[PDB]
A paper describes a structure:
Anti-chemokine activity has been described in the extracts of tick salivary glands, and we have recently described the cloning and characterization of such chemokine binding proteins from a tick salivary gland cDNA library, which we have named Evasins. [name] is a small 94-amino acid protein which binds [name]/MIP-1α and CCL4/MIP-1β with very high affinity (0.16 and 0.81 nM, respectively), and also displays lower affinity binding (3.2 nM) to a closely related member of the CC chemokine family, CCL18/ PARC. This chemokine-binding protein does not share any relevant sequence or structural homology to any other known proteins, notably the viral chemokine-binding proteins, and moreover, is considerably smaller, being only 10 kDa compared to the viral proteins which range in size between 30–40 kDa. The [name] secondary structure is composed of seven beta strands forming three anti-parallel beta sheets, one short alpha helix, and contains four disulfide bridges.
In order to understand the structural basis of the chemokine binding mechanism by [name], we have crystallized the complex (accession code: 3 fpu) between [name] and a variant of the human chemokine [name]. One monomer of [name] binds one monomer of [name] displaying a 1∶1 stoichiometry. Upon complex formation, the N-terminal region of [name] interacts with both the N-terminal and C-terminal regions of [name]. The complex formation induces the stabilization of the entire N-terminal and C-terminal areas of [name] and of the N-terminal segment of [name], which becomes visible in the electron density maps, showing the rearrangement of both N-terminal ends upon binding. Due to interactions in the complex, the [name] N-terminal region (residues Ser2-Thr10) moves by almost 90 degrees with 5AlaB moving circa 20 Å. Three additional secondary structure elements are formed upon binding: the α2 3-10 helix at the C-terminal of [name]; and the α0 3-10 helix and β0 strand at the N-terminal region of [name]. Three specific residues of [name], Thr16B-Ser17B-Arg18B, are targeted by the N-terminal region of [name], through 7 hydrogen bonds. The N-terminal contacts include several hydrophobic interactions, one of which is an important edge-to-face π-π interaction between Phe14A from [name] and Phe13B from [name]. The C-terminal of [name] embraces the N-terminal part of [name] due to an important network of hydrogen bonds and comprising a very important hydrophobic stacking interaction between the Trp89A from [name] and Phe29B of [name]. The crystal structure reveals the C-terminal polyhistidine tag, and includes two metal ions, modelled as Ni2+ atom (believed to be leached from the IMAC resin during purification) and which play an important role in establishing the crystal lattice.
Residue numbers in the entry:
A (entry chain B): 2 to 67
B (entry chain A): 1 to 100
Amino acid sequence: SLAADTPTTCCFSYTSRQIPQNFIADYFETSSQCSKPGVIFLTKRSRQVCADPSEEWVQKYVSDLE
Amino acid sequence: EDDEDYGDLGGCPFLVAENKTGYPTIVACKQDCNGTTETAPNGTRCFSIGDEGLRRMTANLPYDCPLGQCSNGDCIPKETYEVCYRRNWRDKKNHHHHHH
Ligand code: NI
Ligand code: NI
């Protein structure tokens, strides 16, 4: 799109539910200098969504994106 | 199980600009994503440039960015500016240098 050429972001809160795994295309990690930790998931529809990296599903999904 | 069950996905990311050393500051005090809107906490540092302001910036060059604080979803200017930069995800990725 390319999603890698969109601006960096920070998260203030996180999605409330587990996103279906086959719907996730990529991920980005927000800066450690952001006020809170954050993983951004990019869905197949090009939506960027904040997620909490302390959550198990989040790490699993990050890992499975190789 | 926590917090919303089946409403909108939410988790609107806030676009940031960074200073030379990478410290980020949001460019809008409110973000919309699908049916959701989120406001940054009152008192948060912000640049009053907007998401479209940021998307207009050439990546990785310095701009003078007006600084404010958020108040009820709006960035209220102070009398100060900070040099800020648009970075994209590409600028943060992979590892093409190493040392032996
Ligand atoms: Ni090089
Ligand atoms: Ni070498």
